[PDB]
Structure 1
Amino acid sequence: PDVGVLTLDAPAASALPHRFRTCFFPLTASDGAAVPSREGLNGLRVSGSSQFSLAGLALMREQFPPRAVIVDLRRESHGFLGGNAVSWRLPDNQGNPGRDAAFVAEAEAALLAAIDERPDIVVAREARRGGPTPLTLGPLPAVSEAQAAASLGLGYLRLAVSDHTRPDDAVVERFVRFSRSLPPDVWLHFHCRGGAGRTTTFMTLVDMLRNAPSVAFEDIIARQKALGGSDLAKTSDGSAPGRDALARQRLEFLRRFYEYARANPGGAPLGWTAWLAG
């Protein structure tokens, strides 16, 4: 089976990851662009980013509140080689297709163990990340993000979400139950590879779980973009019907979730699965 091209997500020298934002980040009105509703946004105890280097994680920790949790949304196998964030990229970044976080953790641990402290590990670089010339790295220590988070005293939760896709119903169920289990002081920092579709989706889910009964759907979508996320409602001008007709299923899900969070504020009395069955 194809395990993917070992690819660079973030060089070790990178600091704050791209698309980093917290729910306290500014939304500023422009002449021809009004600010969406701010109601309930600041109190969400949530932030997000793209994939960070180890140094980027240590920098972010300087501003994380107590009892912060890194929520890793990547279904693809990934980790760190030295300070570098690296991943195994299948076509369209569909690593570990359909597999849950428990499988992903072991598969990725096996791949990281194979590059741990080996010289001459060749790491592909996308054109957008300083390529196309690959990097040759090693011998460097290879660690999972779970270990990186633990080494900083940070919580860590893995949820397997395929890039460019909505979360599976089983992941949404697990996340709602996780959200309900949290004491009031726990902060969630979401990340994926790019900090766009997946991170923005889950920050939106957190937003809806608190604010769906009192804030309009389009304002929640709009403000997660304005904070620094991606636009979950945007489409191309027709240049990419597939990519456009893929955000479609995700937007349908987000409205299905918005309705659920209005019927079950905070995820209660019914969970996601039950509500769907009803």
Structure 2
Amino acid sequence: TVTEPVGSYARAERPQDFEGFVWRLDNDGKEALPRNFRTSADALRAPEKKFHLDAAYVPSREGMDALHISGSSAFTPAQLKNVAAKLREKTAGPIYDVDLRQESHGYLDGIPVSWYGERDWANLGKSQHEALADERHRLHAALHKTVYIAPLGKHKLPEGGEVRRVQKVQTEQEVAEAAGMRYFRIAATDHVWPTPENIDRFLAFYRTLPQDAWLHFHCEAGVGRTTAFMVMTDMLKNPSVSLKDILYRQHEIGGFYYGEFPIKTKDKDSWKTKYYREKIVMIEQFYRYVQENRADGYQTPWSVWLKSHPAKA
């Protein structure tokens, strides 16, 4: 009947049309902290005008002090150490670097880089296993080789940058552990709703966490995927909070707004429109999943429940 259900639209895109072509600079390392850094203990700010929200609305903060999560963009090793130090002041539990990036990435001579393909879909369609194997192989192959690292500029194409002969290669896991943080990888595709396997994996991981665990989520920019998992965590941990309050508060501390809003993209970014719409509906479906399965201890996972309760456009 249906080729791709709601929540799996990206599966229709062709991986061969977005293969990696350059080592993208993930962070210039000029700031002490990564971009969009925020924690669940932060004060709520005014909502961004583009979401056309009620600036007078004061969402409930119930459970935010105990939530213990944070989010940010990619970072240099030094920046991550700064994050870890800062998060250690808020807790005595393990601090996790939850890496949500499907795209292959790592560090060349301490420089955070990723193998970038159009739309940042260089690993689209790969299983987590295949994406991580590609990553390990590409990182290693760069050792003692000349590479071109560049930030993206006009038209999302390389602009300036630098050329160097790599003397050191590290995975983010190594960088996290060196910063004193535990590491957990979830290979989520950039710009789209996390897959049923991404979410099943996160929920399984969530279940094993000690009470005082602190989760620092991050993606490339620290907006789309980062806010999605932050929201999922808030819903799971504070199931009595209304959907409206979760969405407003995760937005007002510095994340994306995952509720309905007037979507307007630049003509060259019109491809994003349906993925934004898809995220709005899936966000609602996840909330329903939590509400309907919390009472029995989640004896049925998200992927299974979603197939029997498909989302609709």
Is TM-score (shorter-chain normalized) higher than 0.5?
A: yes
CA-to-aligned-CA distance 1:201-254 (integer Å, 9 cap, x gap) = 000000111223x22212211111111112223443464553222111111111
User: Which residue does the alignment assign to 1:243?
Assistant: 272
Is 2:151 aligned against 1:125? yes
Q: Unpaired segments of 5 or more residues in structure 2?
A: 1-15, 48-53, 309-313
User: Which residue does the alignment assign to 2:311?
Assistant: none
Distance in 1, matches of 2:98 and 2:300, equals 23
Alignment TM-score, normalising by the size of structure 1: 0.90
CA-to-aligned-CA distance 1:89-108 (integer Å, 9 cap, x gap) = 11111121122332222211
CA-to-aligned-CA distance 1:152-211 (integer Å, 9 cap, x gap) = 332111111111101110111111111111111211111000000000000000011122
- What does 1:262-273 align with in structure 2 at a 5 Å threshold? 262-265=291-294, 268-273=298-303
Distance in 2, matches of 1:238 and 1:23, equals 29
- Between 1:241-250 and 1:79-88, the stretch displaced more is 241-250
CA apart distance, 1:29: 6.5
C-alpha contact 1:160 1:171 (8 A) present in aligned 2: yes
Structure 1 runs, 4 residues or longer, greater than 6 Å off: none
2:243 to 214, 217, 227: 217
CA RMSD of aligned residues (A): 2.3
User: Which residue does the alignment assign to 2:10?
Assistant: none
CA apart distance, 1:122: 1.1
User: Which residue does the alignment assign to 1:201?
Assistant: 228
- What does 1:13-28 align with in structure 2 at a 5 Å threshold? 13-28=30-45
- Between 1:34-43 and 1:253-262, the stretch displaced more is 34-43
Distance in 2, matches of 1:50 and 1:76, equals 14
User: Which residue does the alignment assign to 2:252?
Assistant: 226
2:201 to 174, 177, 188: 174
User: Which residue does the alignment assign to 1:62?
Assistant: 85
CA apart distance, 1:276: 2.8
Distance in 2, matches of 1:32 and 1:104, equals 41
SS at match of 2:86: coil
Q: Unpaired segments of 5 or more residues in structure 1?
A: none
1:99 to 106, 123, 126: 126
1:9 to 26, 30, 40: 26
- What does 1:145-160 align with in structure 2 at a 5 Å threshold? 145-160=172-187
Residues 75 and 127 (structure 1 numbering): CA distance in 2 closer, same or farther, change over 3 Å?
same
Q: Percent identity?
A: 35
Residues 64 and 101 (structure 1 numbering): CA distance in 2 closer, same or farther, change over 3 Å?
farther
Alignment TM-score, normalising by the size of structure 2: 0.81
2:116 to 89, 92, 110: 89
C-alpha contact 1:75 1:100 (8 A) present in aligned 2: no
